[PDB]
Amino acid sequence: MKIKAISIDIDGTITYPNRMIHEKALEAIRRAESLGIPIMLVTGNTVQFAEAASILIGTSGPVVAEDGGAISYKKKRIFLASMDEEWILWNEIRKRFPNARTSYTMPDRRAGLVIMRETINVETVREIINELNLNLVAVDSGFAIHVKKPWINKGSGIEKASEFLGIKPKEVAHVGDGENDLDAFKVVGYKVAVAQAPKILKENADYVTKKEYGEGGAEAIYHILEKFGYL
Amino acid sequence: KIKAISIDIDGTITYPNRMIHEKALEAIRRAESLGIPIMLVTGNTVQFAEAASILIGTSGPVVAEDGGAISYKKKRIFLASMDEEWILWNEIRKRFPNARTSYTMPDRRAGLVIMRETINVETVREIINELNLNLVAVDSGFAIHVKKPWINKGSGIEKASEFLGIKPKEVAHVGDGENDLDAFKVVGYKVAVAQAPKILKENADYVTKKEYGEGGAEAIYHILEKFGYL
């Protein structure tokens, strides 16, 4: 089919390594929007962070946050999961690993427990999940540990976001930089990975940009616009 | 001498449509590179302010909920809680079924934000007085904020200064509205962007030639220059 929207990660994709917005990605996004191609920001950060990013950058597509657990579009928030077993898990960690900590953003989240990977390894988290017998998965992005329901991921988030836009998920082109972007790659029509992305993501991408980080995100957007006749 | 710069987000470092202005972005990053922390100030949520700090690249504390929330180094401090605000809202919904609150209310803890598109600020004040609640209602032009009378940008900036380890009088503030007078009062240097109301300009040390984001950039460079950082 045809590509009608571009989904793209925030951190490591439209930013500098320190997470601040990269001017080249900012401009590429604004040009894409002006060409009638909505940009859907995707992130493991909170839905509030994602909304702020959309407002400041100027994106018009729904935002997919909490790694696909939360979606916001036109000021309407929709959460694809709620928390319960995550509290059972954390309480056990609290009692057994007094140095373990969760993200300061937990008050804002509703579809995933975020743990500071520097305070406890994901292996230990998974062991407890198995012990208490919980229907949860723990994923280490290398930056933080996300504990969530098995069905929650960037792919399912993008599929739902696509509904709000009125398009098919296969009409979306995704730009990512990490391993969990494989989930998004699975549901979309075109797949792009920025230069510093893991081998596993690159192998599954239709195109790997020459540049990494923000410049890569900009390159990815231009590649998509050009390949699908928008520019 | 000025050691930090506090600056509003909307109307000061953005375009009228709320998008970040590249010139203000460059100026903020230059100030930071030169060793001058930027403290973002806003009536928006603390989460929005934190996001703005990360995306823009500021290192100073952020002052949100119009002074009711401060965040620094991943530590959030709320200077108020809501109680009477909900009593007020309950009465408002009974009398005016079309009045609505901001979708961001679940994120806030120090101020009720009412959609100005749905009810007049004058009406809100009338109800506050009738119920004899200890609250004030301010119209930012974007939304109506109902908060405790002692919560404001100035008191927020003073607290933020404490966390930064500096004195409020070592801060230079850049504002665009009436509510920035509270900030002007506590800081050491005052700047107003071109579209600011007469009341703010008359009390500013410098009024920029440009409006909005371009004005914010001009303000930052004027400050950096005046205090010998350029």
Among B126, B184, B130, residue whose Cα is nearest residue B154: B184
Distance CA A115, CA A89 (A): 11
What are the C-alpha distances in Å from B106 to residues B13, B20, B47, B152? Answer: 26, 25, 11, 20
Cα–Cα distance measured from residue B12 to residue B203, given in angstroms and rounded to the nearest whole number = 17
Report the chain A residue with the minimal C-alpha distance to residue B28: A20
Pairwise CB contact (< 8 Å): A75 & B51: no
CATH architecture designation of domain B81-149: Alpha-Beta Complex (3.90)
Q: Which CATH architecture has domain B1-80+150-230?
A: 3-Layer(aba) Sandwich (3.40)
The full DSSP string for A67-109 is: GGTEEEETTEEEES---SHHHHHHHHHHHH-TT--B-TTGGG-
> Coil, strand or helix: which one is A211?
coil
Resolution (A): 1.6
Cβ neighbours of B45 in A, within 8 Å: 48
The string of DSSP codes covering A109-121 is: -SS-EEE-TTTS-
Residues that constitute the known binding site of A: 9, 11, 154, 177, 181
Work out the end-to-end distance of chain B between its first and last CA atoms, rounded to an integer number of angstroms. Answer: 14
Give the span between the Cα atoms of A15 and A23, in whole angstroms: 8
CA neighbor of A40 nearest in space, from A130, A179, A166, A151: A166
Q: What angle do CA A87, B75, B72 make, to 5 degrees?
A: 150
Query: Is A56–B103 a contact, with Cβ atoms under 8 angstroms apart?
Result: no
CB B145, CB B128: distance < 8 Å? no
**Cα gap A204→A183, rounded to integer Å:** 11
Taking CA atoms, B29 is separated from B22, B26, B173, in Å, by: 10, 5, 16
Are residues B57 and A18, on separate chains, in Cβ contact within 8 Å? yes
CA A159 centroid distance within chain:
13
Type and span of the H or E element at A150 = none
Minimal Cα distance from A47: which residue of B? B47
The structural domains of chain A, with segments of one domain joined by +, span 1-81+151-231, 82-150
Instruction: Return the amino acid letter for B51.
Output: A
A57–B19 C-beta distance less than 8 A:
yes
Q: Can you give the C-alpha Rg of chain A in angstroms?
A: 17
Instruction: Return all residues near A219 (Cβ < 8 A) that are at least 6 apart.
Output: A194, A209, A210, A211
Q: What is the DSSP string of B27-64?
A: HHHHHHHTT--EEEE-SS-HHHHHHHHHHHT--S-EEE
Experimental method: X-ray
Q: Which of B56, B75, B107 sits opposite A20 (nearest CB)?
A: B56
Burial class (CB in 10 A: 0-12, 13-18, 19+), B115: middle
Residue A11 a catalytic site member? yes
The CATH fold of domain A82-150:
Hypothetical Protein Ta0175; Chain: A, domain 2 (3.90.1070)
- Chain B residues inside the 8 Å CB shell of A15: 55
Contact A56 B55 (CB under 8 A): yes
**b/e map of B85-109 (b: 16 or more CB within 10 Å)?**
beebbeebeeeeeebebbebbebbb
How would you write B152-191 as a 3-class SS string? CHHHHHHHHHHHHCCCHHHEEEEECCHHHHHHHHHCCEEE
Nearest to B51 among A23, A53, A76 (CB): A53
CATH H superfamily, domain A1-81+151-231: HAD superfamily/HAD-like (3.40.50.1000)
Alpha-carbon span B84 to B147, nearest angstrom: 9
Which residue among A45, A51, A56 sits closest to B20, beta carbon to beta carbon?
A56
